[PDB]
Structures are given as C-alpha cells and as structure tokens.
Amino acid sequence: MLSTGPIMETLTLTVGSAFEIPGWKLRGEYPAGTTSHLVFTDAAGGTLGEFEGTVSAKEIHYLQAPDDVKNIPHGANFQLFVTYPSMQPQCLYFGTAIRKEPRYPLSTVVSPEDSAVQYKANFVGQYIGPMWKPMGNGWGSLGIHTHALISEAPSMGPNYSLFSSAAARWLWSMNMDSVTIVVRVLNVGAGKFNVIVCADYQMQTYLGIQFETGISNNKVHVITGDGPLNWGYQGDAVNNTTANGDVYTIKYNDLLDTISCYKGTSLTPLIEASGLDVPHGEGFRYTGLAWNTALLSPGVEPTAWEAKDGV
Amino acid sequence: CYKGTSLTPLIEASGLDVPHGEGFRYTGLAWNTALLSPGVEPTAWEAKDGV
Amino acid sequence: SSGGGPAVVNNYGDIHTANYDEFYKGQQRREAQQQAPILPVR
Amino acid sequence: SSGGGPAVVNNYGDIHTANYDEFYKGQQRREAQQQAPILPVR
Amino acid sequence: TDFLKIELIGRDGSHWVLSGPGMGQQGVTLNPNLQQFYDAPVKTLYVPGPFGEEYAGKRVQRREIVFSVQAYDEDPDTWSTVDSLWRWAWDYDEESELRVSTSDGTRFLKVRLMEEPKPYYEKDPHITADNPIVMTVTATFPYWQDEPEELIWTTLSTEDMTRFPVRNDGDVPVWLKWTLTAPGLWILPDFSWGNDMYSRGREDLGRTVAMPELVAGEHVSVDSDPRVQTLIAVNGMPTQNRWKGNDLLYPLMPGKGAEIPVQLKNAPEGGACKLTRPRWYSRPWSRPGV
Amino acid sequence: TDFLKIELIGRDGSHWVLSGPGMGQQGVTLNPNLQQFYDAPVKTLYVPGPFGEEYAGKRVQRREIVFSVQAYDEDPDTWSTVDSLWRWAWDYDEESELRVSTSDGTRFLKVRLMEEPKPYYEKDPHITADNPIVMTVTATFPYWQDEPEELIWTTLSTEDMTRFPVRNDGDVPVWLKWTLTAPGLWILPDFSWGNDMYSRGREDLGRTVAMPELVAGEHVSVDSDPRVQTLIAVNGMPTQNRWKGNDLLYPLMPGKGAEIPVQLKNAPEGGACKLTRPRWYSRPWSRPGV
Amino acid sequence: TDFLKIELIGRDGSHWVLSGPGMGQQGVTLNPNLQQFYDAPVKTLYVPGPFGEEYAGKRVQRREIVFSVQAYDEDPDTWSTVDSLWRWAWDYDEESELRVSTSDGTRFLKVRLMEEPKPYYEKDPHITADNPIVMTVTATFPYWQDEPEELIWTTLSTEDMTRFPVRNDGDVPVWLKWTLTAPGLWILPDFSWGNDMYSRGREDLGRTVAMPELVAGEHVSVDSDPRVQTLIAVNGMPTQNRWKGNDLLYPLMPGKGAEIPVQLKNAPEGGACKLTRPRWYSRPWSRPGV
C-alpha cells in the first residue's frame, strides 16, 4: 500500500438528539488555520449535508442541532476531510451513517376497530367471583343473598355482616362509549341501587341510574359520580314501582349524548337525562353496580346483569 | 314485536317453553303459502345481539 | 441409543439393505393377482 | 467439507434415502399418461 | 428429588417406586437418560408452495421410551427374586401404568414392552446382584392423562334439559364420553368450540345432534374419541345402525369451556346422563393453561 | 450484546427476551449455535449444458431453525413454572413471532414447532433447576418481515384517480394487497417493474388491470400473493368469473418504486382503496441497498 | 503474497481484494482451503472393452467452489456495515466477477451463489466483529478467461478478401465470434485445425461456409459457441432460417493458429467484419503453451 487511505467508520444519528463528534476521538496536531468539514451524501452522489468542525490545536469538535441532521437517512455515506494550512484536503474517515433510534413502521396507528363486546352475570355460585371488583369498601364487601324465603334467584349485594353500602365494578371494560345495561332486579326491602355507566377504573366520575325503593321513596333518579359510594342527583326524578323480577334497560348513547331507562318491554324512557358533565372516551368505559341501605338487610338488588357495547 | 317506530309492542308473549342459552342462539326465516305465488316476503333483514 | 442409528434408519425406510428384484417381483405378483382372473382363456 | 460426504452422496444419487414405492408409482403414472388417451372406451 | 416421583404399576398389580421419595425400596431404581418421556412426539406436514413449503397439519406419534432400571439386592438369591418380579411386571399384550407425581398432580402413561428387555452386564448377574435392565417400552396412546372429570344428571321428568360445565385445562384436545339411559331421545352437544378442521368453525358453534330413540333397556355409551365406535348399547342392539350417518365430530379444544346443554325427551320413566371429560396432557407435568 | 436483541412473542402473547439487553429476565436465555437463522435458505436449479450445467433458476426453501434455550431459576418450583410457561408459548398449529432488533430496526419471523421439543439433561431436571430445551422450529414463510405499510385513499367523487407512493427497500420482491370498496369500477396498476418472467418486461411497464364492476356490498380484497386467490368478495359472490382471464401477475421488484396510479369510475357514493405493501427481508438485519 | 492477487467485483460493482497486495482494506480477507478453484473439473467416459474399458471422451463440469471469507472491523457497527456490503456483493440470479492476477496476467471467473451463505460463529457476531462467512459459489462457465482478442477489417470494395491471424495460446479450444455488416454475402472459415471429432480432421482443413445473403440493415453476429444460437441479426430478421441447416462446427483448438480467410461479395457499399477470439483457460495462472 504505497498510498494511505481513510479509515472506515460509522456515525450514529438519532431523532431529536444533537449530533456530536467529541474532540477526544479526533485528536491530532492541528496548526492554526486548519479546517475540517463533514459531508453527507446519498447513493447518487448528491450532498445530503455539509458541516464544519471546530478545529483546535489538539482536537476537532463537531456539534449540530437535531434539525440539521434530521434529513440524513439511515445508510447515507459520509466523508470527513481535514485541510491543513496551505495544503490540499485529506480524508481521515469515511463510511455510512446509521440511525440508532426507535423506528416507527406504522405511519398512523389508528384506533383499532375494537368490536362490540357483551357480558352477563347471574350469581348462582357460592361467592361473587373475581369478575366483580369491589370498590370503596375494599375486598370482601360483596356477597350473594339466596332469597329462598320468596323463591327467587340469588342476588348480589353488600355482605351485611359488616357493611351497609358497597360498590362493585365489572372486571372488563367496554370498547365503545355507547352501552346498554339490562338488569333484572328484585325489591325485597328498602334501599337504593345504582347502575353505573362510563365510570373510571376507580369509579370516580360516571353516569348512573338509581332505583330507590322504600316505604315512601319509590323513585328513579339520574346520578353523577363523585366517589364509588357517593353521588349527586341531576334534574328531577320519576316515581317508579319495582316488583320482584323487574327488568330495566339503561342505555347510554354517545351520539345524541344521553342516558335513558326503560322498564320491561316499553320503549318509552321512564327517565332520561342529556348533557351531563362527565368525561367520556378511552379510560372511562367501565360499568358497575352500587347498593346503599339504611338498615342491614337487602333492599333492591339485581339477580341478573347484562352489558352490551353500543345502543 | 313492534310495528314501525311504535314504542308499544304490536304483540308480546312470555314464558314460552323453549330451551334458551348456548346452542339455541340461531335465527332464521320461514315462508308458507297455499298458492304458488309470493306472499309476505322480506326485502331487508337485520339481526343484532342484545336488546 | 436408538435415535440416531440403525433404529432410526429403520424409520428412514429402505435406505440401507433393500433389493430391487424382489420388490419388482412382488409388484408383478400383485398385478398378476389383480389381472389374471379377468384375462380370457383364448 | 462437501467433497467426500453427504454432498458427494447427492452426486452418487439415490444411494441413501430413496424408496421404491413412489418410484414405481411415478413410472406407472407416466405409462398411464402415455397410454390412457389411446385406450378404447369399450 | 422430592419434587418428582415416578412409579410403575405392573400388569400384575405390583407397585414399584423408580424415582422420588422411597425409590428403590422394592429393589429397582431408575437410571438416567430416559428418552421420549416428556413431550409427546409430533410430526408436522408440509406441502410444496410458492415460498417453499406450506404447513399442512400435525400428527401425534406413539411413544418409544427407552429407559434403564437397576435391580439390586445384598444377596444374589434375593436379587434373582427382584429381577423375576420386575420381569413379571411387564408384558407385550397388556399395558402397565407409569405414574409421574409432581406438584401439578399425578399423571399416568400406559406402556407395554415393545421388544425383549436387555438385562445384566457382560458377566453373569449373580456376581454383582446389582444389574441394569434396558427396557424399550411403547405408549400407543402417547398423552399423559389424569382421572377424568365425571358429572351425573338424573331426572324424573318426561322432558327435561340440563347444562354440564366443561373446560379443557390441558394442552391437547380431549374427546367426551356420555352414558345415556333408556328409554328416551337425547339431544347431545357437539360444539365446535371455534375449531376450523371442517371449515365450519363458527357455523357449528352451537351444534347439537339427536341420538336415535332408545328402546327400553338400551342404555348406550356415546364415546366421541376416534379409537372406538361412537354408539354402543349395553344390550348389544345396533344403535348406530339407526343413526343415519350422524356422528360426534368435534373434541373439546384446549382452553375452551362452557355449559353444554343436554336435552331428554320422550322418556316416560325419566332417564339419567353421565358425562366423562378426559384430562389429557402432552407432558408429565405442566402448569394449568388458561 | 446491546447491538442485537432477540425476543419471542408467544402464541399466548408472552414476551421473552432471549438475547441482548434484558435477557434472562423471564428465566429463559438463548444458547449459541443456532442454525438457518440469518440467511433465507435458497436452492438453485441447474440443467445440463454445453460446458457442464446451466443455471435454471432459484427456489427459496422454508426455514428450519434448530436452537437451544436455557430455562434457569434458583428454586425448582419456580423453575418448573418458567419451563411450563416457555412450553405454553409454543404450538404446532399456530405461529409465534421471533423478533430481532438491531440498528437497522426490528424484523420478525413467524415460527412454529416443527417437532416436539427435546428438554432437560439425562437426570432429574429439578436437581439443577437450570435445564436446556432444544427447539426445532420452522418458518413456512422464510423471509424476515417488518410491519407492512398501509395507505388509504378515500374519495367522494364518482370518478377519481390517485397516486400511491410505493418502494421496495428489501432484497426480495413483495406482493401488494388491495382492499377496494363497492360499488364502482377500479383500475389497478400491475406494473412489471422490468420483471421479465412473462416475456413482457418492457411491454408491461405501465400495465393496468381493470377489475370487474362491483355491485353494492361487494367489497373486494385483491391480493397479488400466489398463496391466496387474487379476487375475494366479502359477501361470497363469485367475482372472478366476470374478470375474463385477466390477473395481477407482477410483484414489486427490489429497488423499484413509483407513484402507481389507482383509478375509480362509476362510483355513486365514492370509494375507498387501501394498499398494503409488505416489507420482506432475507436477513434479520442488513443495511439499506439501492 | 505479491505473486498472486485475488479480487471480487460484486454484482453491484463493489471491489474487494481478498488476497494479495492490499488485501483486507475493505474489511474482508480470504481464509485458506478453497476448493475447485484451480483446475476445471472434468470427468472422463469409458465404455466396456476387451481389455477392460476404452476411452469414450471427456466432459467439463461446472465449478462448485467452497471458500470462506473473514469480515473484520474494530467496532461492531462498522463490522455490520462490512458484512452487509459483502452480502450485497452477491446474488443467485446474476454473477459477480472473481479475478486472479499473477505474472501471467489477470483471468476472471463469473460466479454466483449456489446456496445461502453460512455466516458468523456460534455466538452472536457483534461480540467479535471478526466473523467468517462460508460461501458456496458456482461457475456455470468453468473456464478462467481473459479479455478476448478482437480484430477489425473494413472495406469499400464490392468484392474483397482478408486474412485474420488467429492463435489459441490457452489450454482449451475456443469458439470464435464474428460481427458482419450488411448487405453482402460473407464466406467465413470453419477450419477443423486437425480436430477429428467428426472424423473429418483433414477433410475440413480448409473448410469455408457461406452465410446467407444479408439484406440491407441486417447486420449479423455469428457466435460459434454452443451456448448461443449461431446467427443472430440485429434487426430481428430470422437469418438462420435462410441457412439450410449450415453451421460452424469447429472450435479453435489449443496450439493452433493460421491466417484464416474472410471473403465478402455482392457488397455495393462495402462492409466490415470483426473477429473476436476468446482467451479461455482451465487454470487461474499458467505459462503460455506453444
């Protein structure tokens, strides 16, 4: 090898990162007036970039903002030239620049078409089961009441051994904002039963339909969530009677934003609210139930629960 | 069965002795005419899970 | 022991010792059994 | 490496793994292709 | 170790502990390097394709287990007794059980002598009274299995229906068995569980098949596994002959379960049903799969 | 090393890091000497000629990767959990991803169990709780893949036209997929890109094929891949019968690309066209070539 | 050594020096033990005879070269670039050049990938950044060749004649190529050079064959090698169809040379001819043979 050549190296580029060549790896004896330039070129011979390095007496330093090196692609050729005073330029290093960064193959990851989902619950086993997550009162705050003295299906409610009001959340989340909750419920006492829609994972804010059954309440309300076991009423309320084995359909419609309740086979809403200020969208698609009884005996409780995504 | 957009059922029945649940979720159509001519026929049909 | 030697050569099948003349004669005998009763006597 | 092992066994041809059944079936298929169209329908 | 226990229950009912706690108490221990013992052998099929070969399916192969045992005793006469007992524990015609017990439970494999055992060293075995026997056994059914889950539903009604909870916790599909009393017409589920072997995956999601009307005394066993005929009556009547080409086509796929419905009609006495769900596994031990 | 990271995404969604940063966190590491992992196996055909044999073409073969992993843990029980999870990560019927990440990006390979795994040493695995599993996996599609590029063009006009930018940066040709809405008459590009396998490399430089007129609800998937039928109607109508023998014949040759024209006519409600371009490579990593 | 230099010019035009002066500058060196590299593989034929077997002839076989290269760099990223460039320098469909330079000159062999390369060690190659690639390349044309010797004779006369000095200094017979202008009737030599392959060795010592009368614009190339059709017109006219089964039959045998005569008649413009004599050798280096 009569004539020496350059050294094959690589240059690392990262999006949003400053491109820097430290001076300690370009050490040498550079007299005052020595220049250095770095040229980035494509496969056709076109210059994709040109930079001038800070040449000092003992090192050459390169430092560029990320905007300058944004447009150089992965695999572009590079040459580094040093020009000594009154001498022709010579190439020290050459090679290809690699881009060491997270790479995004999908141009846009649109929201995947999470299809409609359906769930159901009947409460025939001994215990509640892991599909219901207790809220507010903590673990062990739910239970199943047999209702064998009235010949009815078992129902879910707070274990009245140590709790009087308690909430549960469905383990899985809905995929769309619009939902339908069909509950078959019994009224074996006095209390309040909340069907919870569009809740957070902690059931902090939500829409809901409340059935109060008592000696004088006999009413249905629309409620907004502030805590799993606390709520605030919205608008007025409709008087309602709840017989054993009564089926209520609570539909939340995202478009034409509204919440409505239907009794049995009637399509006329017994109660309806619109424009309630509750956050919606992703992360606010959880559903649940809640019970609150003044006494320590079951009041109005569901024997059957069903959820469908969409109206 | 609701006719048109009426919110009151045109017809209704309950408690019929038919098995329900998994394995009994199929749907379909049927036609019977005394004459060899079309009678009541569906132009468009649509099925949806849930109520 | 068995896997990787003659015990897997047996699984390979007719790679080592296996004769052509006997196989051909057996095929001819099977064809003769198939076709002999239907051939004419003339 | 290749010269003097399985890579030259491949040059040898059908010395190791090779069965008679599919060879006979292929010969029969070729003869059937040759003779079937000209066989009478009777 | 105490994390694994291997036993053999011979054709004659003898019990041997080859490995684990209490191993060698009967004189026979298990030597290392036992093969085709853990995973069920499977060969995959491939057809020629544009990009090389295309997957065509899988076939499970029978197990060819080669393992060595070591029969030992202090005196040669007792060693001879032990060796004879070990030989009597095995046969070609009938199978002996090989049980593996771990923290996942006890699973058994039925194995028979594939060929003659190879006993002893190069010298006579009475010199040592401690000799190895090389055994080449085979498992025609290659899956490790546990005791099946059995459920019973009896009724007195002329017409009734029930739901059997069913769930395949193993890694291989299992084939259900039914025991149906007579008289009566039964409707049995043959759910596909989404399996696409017949290109009817979700078409046969809720498939139910009607058994032929059983006459008095014609209690039937309905085994869906392919090894055995589907309908067999206990009185010898040809029940399947009246079952016009119908069959149970689908096994219970792994990870699948539901409340499968069983219907009984035209039963003046009111009959009984029994469901047997096998627990088949491809490995001696494995954590439950969801 | 930090320059190369190897992961497995199992059939059950489990994520394992076999090599690179974070290797062995799930208990399983990768052992050396893995074969048929880097270059796609290609066989070349030769036919007799005047000076020996003449080149007659190439055929790519399915990948057969034989590699070993090591499942390790401090205690035998949790080691058994890890080993069971690793086994559950694999199957014969369904494929799992083997992903290689380097400075050239991330490329995956769909691999399935070719045969039963060969686990453990000759002795009881619970003795060491650190055992190797020999895996013989196969890749039916032998090319390392990146995520395919998807482009959407929606128009409300009755007649419209668009230019889809397309470019093959890989070393192997790729086959494009189209998803066309209905109704409407589509004209799709079938450019040869100079490929001369039908003796029309220059005649078909700007070739366009007119799909049959689509009636309402007859949305079509038009895949050029030979493995699948070109025209597939979503509702099941036979739409290839109205196609008069015309077909999409050419793949996207390596190093080629342009703005291919897609035309829509006679669309009373507009139309939507989706173009999926696969990104196939013959190596886990490689610098871009042009 | 400085007595031998080996270079590779890839299908992409890249230049590598595997051995000799300046070897390894591009990062790739040549490992020892390369096979079927020097002598052209030839197999001889024998018929049964009274004294054993009788010579029946020879056939030259295609070269199946197996050789290892070593790709090295100080840092793994640059090593990865070097390995990718080396891989890009090869292909299956098209051949890259392999040149050997000695005191006898430079001779090149056209080689293509016979199968997938076998790269790297057992562990990942980024640990070492110095890894071997085993490559099985093939030479469809097995002879080493130099740049062919070309001569041109033009004329303005209607009828003319010329002498071309020709001499095979190589090891193997070479096949002459002619380029003839149009219009005009050419008579070209097809001397046997004493070759007795057709049993006409001295009967065809001064054989001359007349090409068909070329029409205007129908310049022809007459390549005597058997790989290619003999007569091919540049305007696409079917010239060999007008040649009544005539052909050039004899190559230029080694050690043979003369002033071969070319005759041109009926050329109103006065045409030109060009003679190309290939320089084929069976060895990368060899002293000239008289």
Three-state SS annotation for chain F: CCCCEEEEECCCCCEEEEECCCCCCCCEEECCCCCCCCCCCEEEEEEEECCEEEEEEEEECCEEEEEEEEEECCCHHHHHHHHHHHHHCCCCCCCEEEEEEECCEEEEEEEEECECCEECCCCCHHHHCEEEEEEEEEECCCCEEEEEEEEEEEECCCCEEEEEEEECCCCCCECCEEEECCCEEEEEECCCCCCCCCCCCCCCCCCEEECCCECCCCCEEEECCCCCCCEEECCCCCCCCCCCCCCCCCCECCCCEEEEEEEEECCECEEEEEEEEEEEECCCCCCCCC
State whether residue F14 sits within 8 Å of chain G by CB. no
The beta-carbon neighbor of B19 closest among E259, E260, E261 is: E261
Decide if E285 and F226 are in contact by the 8 Å CB cutoff.
no
G74 DSSP 8-state letter: S
State whether residue F289 sits within 8 Å of chain G by CB. yes
G chain contacts of residue A10, beta-carbon cutoff 8 Å: 75, 77-78, 81
E chain contacts of residue F88, beta-carbon cutoff 8 Å: 171, 286-287, 289
What crossing angle do the helices spanning D20-35 and C20-35 adopt, rounded to 10°? 50
What are the backbone dihedrals phi and psi of residue F91, each rounded to the nearest 5 degrees, phi first? -160, 170
Residue of A nearest to B50 (CA): A308
Q: In this structure, how many other beta carbons lie within 10 angstroms of the beta carbon of residue F140?
A: 20
Note whether G122 and F66 are within 8 A (CB). Answer: no
State the residue for tokens 């005539």: G246
What are the backbone dihedrals phi and psi of residue A273, each rounded to the nearest 5 degrees, phi first? -135, 155
Residue type, E229: Q
What are the backbone dihedrals phi and psi of residue A178, each rounded to the nearest 5 degrees, phi first? -70, 135
State whether residue E269 sits within 8 Å of chain F by CB. no
State whether residue G75 sits within 8 Å of chain F by CB. no
The beta-carbon neighbor of B49 closest among A118, A267, A268 is: A118
Decide if A267 and B7 are in contact by the 8 Å CB cutoff.
yes
Judged by 3 or more CB pairs under 8 A, whether C touches G is no
B chain contacts of residue A266, beta-carbon cutoff 8 Å: 7-8
The DSSP line for G246-277 is ------B-TT-EEEEEEEEES-SS--EEEEEE
Residue type, F145: Q
The DSSP line for E70-131 is EEE-SSHHHHHHHHHHHHHT--SSS-EEEEEEETTEEEEEEEEESS--EES-SS-TTTTSEE
Residue E241 has which token pair?
């002959």
Q: Which residues of A have a CB under 8 Å from any CB of G?
A: 1, 5, 8-10, 12, 95-96, 98
CA F20 to chain centre: 24
Does E132 sit behind a cis peptide bond, omega within 30 degrees of 0 on the bond before it? no
The beta-carbon neighbor of B2 closest among A118, A180, A267 is: A267
How many residue pairs bridge chain C and chain D with CB atoms within 8 Å of each other?
14
A chain contacts of residue B8, beta-carbon cutoff 8 Å: 266-268
Sorted by sequence, the CB contacts under 8 Å of residue E37 that are 6+ apart come out as E63, E65, E67, E284
A chain contacts of residue B2, beta-carbon cutoff 8 Å: 267
Residue G85 has which token pair?
């460039």
Sorted by sequence, the CB contacts under 8 Å of residue A36 that are 6+ apart come out as A26, A52, A53, A55, A60, A80, A81, A82, A83
Note whether F139 and F65 are within 8 A (CB). Answer: yes
Residue of A nearest to F278 (CA): A105
CA A104 to chain centre: 20
Helix (H, G, I), strand (E, B) or coil at E245: coil
Distance CA A284, CA A202 (A): 10
B1 CA to chain A: closest CA distance, Å?
10
Note whether F257 and F198 are within 8 A (CB). Answer: no
State whether residue G66 sits within 8 Å of chain D by CB. yes
State whether residue G246 sits within 8 Å of chain F by CB. no
The beta-carbon neighbor of F287 closest among G84, G115, G122 is: G84
Note whether A255 and A177 are within 8 A (CB). Answer: no
**Radius of gyration (Cα) for chain B, nearest Å?**
15
A chain contacts of residue B49, beta-carbon cutoff 8 Å: 116, 118, 308
Distance CA E76, CA E221 (A): 51
CB-based contacts of B12-20 (< 8 A; 24+ apart in sequence): B12/A265, B19/E161, B19/E261, B19/E263
Distance CA F78, CA E289 (A): 16
G chain contacts of residue A76, beta-carbon cutoff 8 Å: none
State whether residue E260 sits within 8 Å of chain B by CB. yes
| First-to-final CA distance of chain D | 60
Distance CA G86, CA B43 (A): 67
Nearest CA to F279 out of F175, F203, F201 is that of: F175
Test the F interface: residue of G87, G121, G228 with most F CBs within 10 Å: G87
Distance CA E287, CA F85 (A): 8
Does A112 sit behind a cis peptide bond, omega within 30 degrees of 0 on the bond before it? no
Q: In this structure, how many other beta carbons lie within 10 angstroms of the beta carbon of residue G145?
A: 17
Residue of F nearest to G134 (CA): F39
The beta-carbon neighbor of B21 closest among E191, E207, E261 is: E261
The beta-carbon neighbor of E50 closest among F119, F127, F227 is: F227
- The two beta strands, A219-225 and A207-213, are antiparallel
> Cα angle vertex E267, ends E262, E270, to 5°?
80
Helix (H, G, I), strand (E, B) or coil at E139: strand
Note whether F115 and F66 are within 8 A (CB). Answer: no
E94 CA to chain C: closest CA distance, Å?
24
Residue F20 has which token pair?
């690179």
Residue of G nearest to F47 (CA): G140
**Radius of gyration (Cα) for chain D, nearest Å?**
18
Longest dimension (CA), chain C: 60
F215 CA to chain E: closest CA distance, Å?
26
Does A130 sit behind a cis peptide bond, omega within 30 degrees of 0 on the bond before it? no
Note whether A96 and A107 are within 8 A (CB). Answer: no
Sorted by sequence, the CB contacts under 8 Å of residue F64 that are 6+ apart come out as F35, F36, F41, F114, F136, F137, F138, F139
Query: What method did the depositors use to determine the structure?
Result: cryo-EM
Number of H helices, E strands in chain D: 2, 0
Distance CA F280, CA F108 (A): 10
3-state secondary structure chain A: CCCCCCEEEEEEECCCCCEEECHHHCCCCCCCCCEEEEEEECCCCCEEEEEECEECCCCEEEEECHHHHCCCCCCEEEEEEEECCCCCCEEEEEEEEEECCCCCCCCCCCCCCCCCCEEEECCCCCCCCCCEEEECCCCCCEEEECCCCCCCCCEEEECCCCCCEEEEEECCCCCCCCEEEEEEEEECCCEEEEEEEEECCCCCCCEEEEEEECCCCCEEEEEEECCCCCEEEEEEEEECCCCCCEEEEEEEECCCCEEEEEECCCCCCCEEEECCCCCCCCCCCEEEEEEECCCCCCCEEEEEEEEEECC
Decide if A10 and G78 are in contact by the 8 Å CB cutoff.
yes
State whether residue F106 sits within 8 Å of chain A by CB. yes
Decide if C3 and E136 are in contact by the 8 Å CB cutoff.
no
C-alpha dist (Å) from residue F236 to A83, F218, F231, F240: 71, 8, 11, 11
Distance CA F260, CA F190 (A): 9
What are the backbone dihedrals phi and psi of residue A163, each rounded to the nearest 5 degrees, phi first? -135, 155
Note whether E135 and E64 are within 8 A (CB). Answer: no
